[PDB]
Design a binder for this molecule. Structure first.
Ligand SMILES: *[C@@H]1O[C@H](CO)[C@@H](O)[C@H](O)[C@H]1NC(C)=O
Ligand SMILES: *[C@@H]1O[C@H](CO)[C@@H](O)[C@H](O)[C@H]1NC(C)=O
Ligand SMILES: [Zn+2]
Ligand SMILES: [Zn+2]
Ligand SMILES: [Zn+2]
Ligand SMILES: [Zn+2]
Lengths: 215, 523, 209, 523, 215, 209
């Protein structure tokens, strides 16, 4: 159904290079140009470049002349975006996008995005703590002391969606992030229904499933 | 401010270089056209001229086994590789229905595709929305040039657009768009479209605001001076029309099959008014080398086509004249061949009193798409044949009254001289026209071959007599404006596939030599 | 070519006509598109060729303009429209607008306050985190104040507010008071006082170790 | 004194009963003629009438496989078995030269064979002496009847008599013999001969003493009243001539192929003057049974012939009209087939410029000797074909100037209407005649198919241009009076055997359906 | 060149039957009628009949009412003539003949003839006696007392022809024929040349070679 | 139909024109033929259709006539023409003429007379045959008279004359006097007297037992 699936979040030191992948399905990959754009915090969507996957010919935004290299594997229906000499300013969400047609850049199709964090700071896995309800009812999870972003929180493998509030991460004074994922559920369901918060953190390969229980 | 208008029209799957007559290239050194050679000329012009626009006036679709197999994907790909700036929709762009246009041409193109006089309806409206446009304002240097498309009003009868596409009159649809462009401060407007030299002349004259008309459909060749090949010019290049608002509007067409590249240099004043116009089509002959990169690409794509280039159907010792200059104007030996094959297919043994149930054949010249050359040891291959009959239609049996068939022959020549597809080729019929007569009254003699006889011989057509005729399904369905056939036919039975009927006959005959023998005569 | 969006931010009630502008530094013909972006997601194409609506986008969304001055409209503001809208040009190269954050005005809704004590598992690291949840309230203007016993805290604690709800059109606030294990195991009653327009008097939620 | 004359002429090997059209008998119940049936009628008449004479006016030789194999021995044998009283020599009796006439026919006959205008010369004089006679006085009851022969003056051009036979003018040769008979006190004289209805009338008009003329050659059908079959009478039976000496002279002919038995009753006065004449030819249809003894004999002789009927060459879905009433008068579809067969045989792939070295064919009607019926599942056998082309000739290639060919076309029609053999069937030629014009100036339009062209098409004949034509050796040799061909041809190359050319063509084609398409047109 | 070869002389008693054969060569036997005629001493050539060899149909002279039967053997190209109830009047030379053509009986071709002798008497062989010259010169042979007519005299196996006079046979008073064959030779050759008369008589199978010598 | 030949018998000189006739009882038109017959041989066709000469027959032979009156001519009589000529009709049935024997007139030639005594082999049977040979003479009119010793015999003896010739045109005569052995052995001198136009006086040839 025309889906673009990107490689997951990366954390790279300043000076390093990063290669983001974009797998296309639902149409003839080789027949349409693939765009690369990014979104840096409060900076506005910025074009990187585009590639013709038939011959590998690309056109780049002058801002990344000699820094970005666009490639593709035809047999794998995948487009690659490699950004070298990584600066802290490259901390952004990287997107691959395709047009409604091959003429204009009216991006009807987008990849989920790939967060690239350019830091010299050391990667740390979160410590997940439960937020037990005190005797309609609320309970949650405290995702404390982690680096870098992002962190993804699910409630019961991802099927419990109603009343869920996963709060934006806050940078502490230690240079570590602290996140809270909370859920409002009926009080009557505290002594039957189970609540498990599934915390994933790709850069440190942390996958914690915490059981939230009273008192 | 000077603009260079590079233009093609009616390329009809002529991706590879062809013979002078547009048939399969044999002696490469005498070969012409093709996208690899067109690329070279286009690139050379772009380097020398500051303001260039490369335009196509439709009918890229249908013509050779390139289209049979790649179904428009080769059009999108190679037109993108030549970097066309815009394309207007022709009639043959609907040969595989709306769905065959949307995918792949409309979605894969890297340039706008235009019409303006095509309005989508029902479920199609949202499905085609933004994939084709009435016009596009394009940046050319420091300036902007508005290009507004148009497609033949006759397309529902010539192709398969379906029921959810409405084809408005060109002049009526163009006037609001051009008027709108002038309000958006666009002073240089090109009318690019596929309707025919006569309509292009009417657009130039009647649509206020149109600076230059770039056309197609009629395969019109215009030239200023002594022409470089076998084509005879219909007029000078450009053809100057005087508008009803007293303006000189240049009208251009570049023949067909990518043999020539339309070249017109326009000098515009600050207000967008044409000061001067000069130019000529460029003959794309072996002097212009083929681009090595585009040739390597065409060759990569040619592999999937080769399993049809082999096996000889039969031989011909005569040139098979399937050229439109012939088949759309008068009796052509390819026409007689296809009709002879059509009669031969329907040989059914029944009743002593009938030598055969059917003796008559009618075939529109617009159905014959290519000649076949006899000079490569007289070989006729499936490929050679697929360029003559590309539509994948059937040769059907119909019951027609003499009056219906007389009306059919009147329609056949009602607007003779415009190179239109409705001109009829025949079998078991001897027709005589007096074209100096008024349309609807040009048939002076119409004799038909008998069926209820043991010795077949020609007798005059009787108005109230019912005759059996072999004819393509396209005509049985009222194609090329043969509405009287669809409406008045008494019976309709579908037959065998067009190409198979002609291949079978070529194979039965082994060696063919059809002549122009006087089946159709004028004065 | 620079794409400048004014209003930059705006609030409107449900059912209102919302108009947002995009200005191009030079003529871009009708080569403008509009997108809707929700927090953790990629932008969604809404309008292209300045006025042509993309496939399933509802008829209440529309676009207008030609070269330089562009307009985007929501003719009947719905809670699902809660997003940042971007304009784009594809005339010369490719540039985007800096966005317009759309927020919806709703009736005053009081927050449902909750207090969460630090878990025994957290008392391993040597620090204690006591969080206060302010669930589904409007407007976002809310005052969270921590009381260690009766002593008002004014150094520790970090606030965090969710993006407006797509259905409810409310906000949720999280405030986390952080102390060391020893400092925490010194005091008894920890409180979180909440002041909001929906609350008649400041609501306090407490617990004791 | 009463005399019943029974007569046949132009039997052309039709020994067995045939179809109404002279072709091979299929449905025996609808079959006509044959010697077995003729015997029965002759025998019945001899029993009822006291004074009977059975006469044959020539052309017993050539027509079917019977002659191809038995070469005249079947003529001698079955004419002896029917007890013919006399026979005059026809032109076809010289098809196998003098030697082919002397043996078997002249030496095996049990009746006199007569001529009177044929004089032998040189070594032949003694060799043929007494084998043929100018006349023969025959006893009929108590009376005597003189029978005086004559053969067409044109025989040297129609057959192979050789150089030692001189063909004198009929009227000049007959007068002394008739005058001599009257001095020998013979008052009842019959002129039996093979020169045609026009000559027969001239003999009756100019030869003093002739009481009755019995003729042949022109296949003339005379009848009084409503005829019994498809033949259309040229006049009443007998046709009455008023002589220059003022006498009424009955002239008779009995059509051809033994379909009819000429029956003429004459009453003479004591001085041998015709005082009464009546009669009509008898249609020999299935009502008259075949004689069992003659049928058993024909069957014994038929075994050696069965080799030519054992294989189908191909099929025809149309009636193949090779009847003289059509082929000697107008365009016939058999004529077209043979010419199409003729050109197909000469397909030589040499050089460009020319699509084929030869495009034109001419075939004298007199060369087409039978139709082919399509009703026995459309089968064509070697036998069926051998009746159409029996002469064992060749189809040759000649180079004629346009003038020579124009003269050829004038000769074709110079005496149109007499059922003469020189009328031409064509291929790759479109001729138009105005027969109301003076002989030698009857051709009004003559267009020919091009060779030095890639697409064959018709252009007018140029008098000084040399054209290649396919034509039988008979015409190349000056046959049927085509002296301008022999004399003016620029080159002559012999080709393949006539019958082989046409069977090969049928076998290649599998199923044939030639039409009458307007190659020859009148006014 | 067209040849007709007949059976050979016959001697039959009155009341008996005789069958004479005629073998035709040089032409197609079955295609022409064959005639039969007889020549009796001093009684003129008389027609017997003719036959069509193809079907065996014959036309006969009325004189031979019955008696005569004409047949043929197609495979042998031979025609047969059988005459029954033999009378002394049938003592004749029987001929088969064929016309120049099949129309008229202009007999261009004849058989050698077959002598049929009708007699009630007895067959007797001749007694050959020499006729010695008495001292240009003559000598001979006397062929005395022989009843059956067919006899033949040769001088030295048949090649001495000059001066030979074989006189016609004369009927004596005994009913026996007496014949004389004489030869005139030079007188000078009587003592240096030999003379042998070869008398043949087929009906009695007599073959006498007599030496003629002086005195 | 009866065919009657007058002259019936003839004698003419080499080479005189000889004409012989054939009369038909009824008209036979021209359905008449002429043949030449020599002693031991079959007839040879000479003329047919009354006037037509058969192949190879010499031009000196000719025929003429029509119905009833027929004529056969030898314009230069040759010694080879010595034969019997027959006419024939094939008009109604088939009849022949009774013939015309042709003999040639020559100059008078005397016979060479010879006497042959009876052989000793003959004296076994009991009878004696004494033959007299008259060799090559013209005309045939010759008188042979036997003298026993010297009584004239007028009972015994049988004459025999050969057919004319082909070259010489002469005749040969044989006379055979027959006596019994006893009657023969009684007399001494046996004589044969010959009287002919070529002989001045009757020549007598004798012998004695
Ligand atoms: C190509 O066409 C131009 C224009 O007619 C001519 O001058 C040139 O010779 C042509 N070249 C060839 C190879 O035919
Ligand atoms: C034969 O022909 C005669 C007319 O001459 C006709 O009366 C008769 O019916 C015919 N017989 C057949 C079997 O056709
Ligand atoms: Zn076209
Ligand atoms: Zn078109
Ligand atoms: Zn004839
Ligand atoms: Zn004839």
């Amino acid at each position: 159904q025309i889906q673009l699936v990107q490689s997951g979040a990366e954390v790279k030191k300043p000076g390093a290079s990063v290669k983001v992948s974009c797998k296309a399905s639902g149409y003839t990959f080789a027949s349409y140009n693939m765009y690369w754009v990014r979104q840096a915090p409060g900076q506005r969507l910025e074009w990187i470049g585009y590639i013709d996957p038939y011959n590998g010919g690309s056109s780049y935004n002058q801002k990344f002349k000699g820094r970005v290299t666009l490639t593709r594997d035809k047999s794998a229906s995948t487009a690659y975006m490699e950004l070298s000499s990584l600066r802290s300013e490259d901390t952004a969400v990287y997107y691959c996008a395709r047009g409604y047609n091959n003429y204009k850049a009216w991006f009807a199709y987008w990849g989920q995005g790939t967060l690239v964090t350019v830091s010299s700071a050391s990667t740390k896995g979160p410590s997940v703590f439960p937020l037990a309800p005190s005797s309609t009812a609320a309970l949650g999870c405290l995702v404390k002391d982690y680096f870098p972003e992002p962190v993804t929180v699910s409630w019961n493998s991802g099927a419990l969606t109603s009343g869920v509030h996963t709060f934006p991460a806050v940078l502490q004074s230690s240079g570590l992030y602290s996140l809270s994922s909370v859920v409002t559920v009926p009080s009557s369901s505290l002594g039957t229904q189970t609540y498990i918060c599934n915390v994933n953190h790709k850069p440190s390969n942390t996958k914690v499933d915490k059981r939230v229980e009273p008192k | 401010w000077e603009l260079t208008i590079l233009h093609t029209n009616d390329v009809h799957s002529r991706l590879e270089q062809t013979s002078e007559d547009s048939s399969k290239c044999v002696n490469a050194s005498r070969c012409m056209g093709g996208v690899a050679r067109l690329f070279t000329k286009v690139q050379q012009i772009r380097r020398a001229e500051p303001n260039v626009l490369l335009l196509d006036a439709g009918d890229q679709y249908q013509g050779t086994i390139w289209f049979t197999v790649y179904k428009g994907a080769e059009v999108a790909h190679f037109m993108n590789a030549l970097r066309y700036d815009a394309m207007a929709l022709g009639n043959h762009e609907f040969d595989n229905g709306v769905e065959g246009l949307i995918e792949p041409l409309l979605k894969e193109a890297k340039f706008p595709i235009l019409s303006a006089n095509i309005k989508a309806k029902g479920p199609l409206a949202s499905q085609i929305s933004g994939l084709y446009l009435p016009y596009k304002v394009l940046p050319v240097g420091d300036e902007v040039v508005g290009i507004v498309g148009y497609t033949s009003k006759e397309t529902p009868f010539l192709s398969n657009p379906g029921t959810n596409l409405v084809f408005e009159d060109e002049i009526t649809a163009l006037q609001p768009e051009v008027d709108k462009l002038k309000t958006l401060n666009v002073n240089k407007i090109i009318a690019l479209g596929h309707s025919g030299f006569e309509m292009d002349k009417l657009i130039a004259q009647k649509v206020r605001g149109v600076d230059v008309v770039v056309g197609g459909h009629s395969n019109t060749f215009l030239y200023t001076g002594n022409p470089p090949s076998k084509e005879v010019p219909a007029g000078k290049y450009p053809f100057i029309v005087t508008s009803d608002d007293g303006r000189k509007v240049p009208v251009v067409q570049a023949y067909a099959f990518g043999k020539y590249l339309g070249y017109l240099k326009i000098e515009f004043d600050e207000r967008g008014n044409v000061i001067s116009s000069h130019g000529n089509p460029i003959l794309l002959n072996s002097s212009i080398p083929e681009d090595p990169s585009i040739k390597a690409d065409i060759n990569k794509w040619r592999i999937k086509l080769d399993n049809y280039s082999t096996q000889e159907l039969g031989k011909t010792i005569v040139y098979l004249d399937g050229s439109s200059q012939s088949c759309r104007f008068r009796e052509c030996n390819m026409g007689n061949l296809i009709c002879d094959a059509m009669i031969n297919n329907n040989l059914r043994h029944t009743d002593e009193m009938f030598w055969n149930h059917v003796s008559m054949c009618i075939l529109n010249g617009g159905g014959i798409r290519s000649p076949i050359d006899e000079r490569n040891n007289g070989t006729i291959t499936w490929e050679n044949l697929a360029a003559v009959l590309p539509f994948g239609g059937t040769f059907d049996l119909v019951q027609l009254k003499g009056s219906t068939l007389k009306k059919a022959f009147e329609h056949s020549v009602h607007r003779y001289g415009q190179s239109t597809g409705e001109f009829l080729q025949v079998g078991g019929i001897h027709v005589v026209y007096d074209l100096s007569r008024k349309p609807g009254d040009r048939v002076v003699k119409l004799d038909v071959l008998c069926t209820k006889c043991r010795v077949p011989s020609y007798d005059p057509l009787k108005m109230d007599e019912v005759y059996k005729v072999i004819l393509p399904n396209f005509l049985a369905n009222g194609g090329d404006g043969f509405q009287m056939i669809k409406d008045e036919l008494l019976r309709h039975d579908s037959g065998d596939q067009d190409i198979n009927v002609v291949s079978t006959y070529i194979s039965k005959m082994k060696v063919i030599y059809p002549a122009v023998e006087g089946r159709i005569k004028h004065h | 070519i620079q794409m400048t969006q004014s209003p930059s931010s705006l609030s409107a009630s449900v059912g209102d006509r919302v108009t947002i502008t995009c200005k191009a530094s030079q003529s871009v013909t009708n080569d403008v598109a509009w997108y809707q972006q929700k927090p953790g997601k990629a932008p969604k194409l809404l309008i292209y060729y300045a006025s042509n609506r993309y496939t399933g986008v509802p008829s209440r969304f529309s676009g207008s303009g030609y070269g330089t001055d562009f307009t985007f409209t929501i003719s009947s503001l719905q809670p699902e429209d809660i997003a940042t809208y971007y304009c784009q040009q594809d005339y010369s190269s490719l540039t985007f607008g800096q966005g317009t954050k759309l927020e919806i005005k709703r009736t005053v809704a009081a927050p449902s306050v909750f207090i969460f004590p630090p878990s025994d598992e957290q008392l391993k690291s040597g620090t204690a985190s006591v969080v206060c949840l302010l669930n589904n309230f409007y407007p976002r203007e809310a005052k969270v104040q921590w009381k260690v016993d009766n002593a008002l805290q004014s150094g520790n604690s970090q606030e965090s507010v969710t993006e407006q709800d797509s259905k409810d059109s409310t906000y949720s606030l999280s405030s986390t008071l952080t102390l060391s294990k020893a400092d925490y195991e010194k005091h008894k009653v920890y409180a979180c006082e909440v002041t909001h327009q929906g609350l008649s008097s400041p609501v306090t939620k407490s617990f004791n170790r």
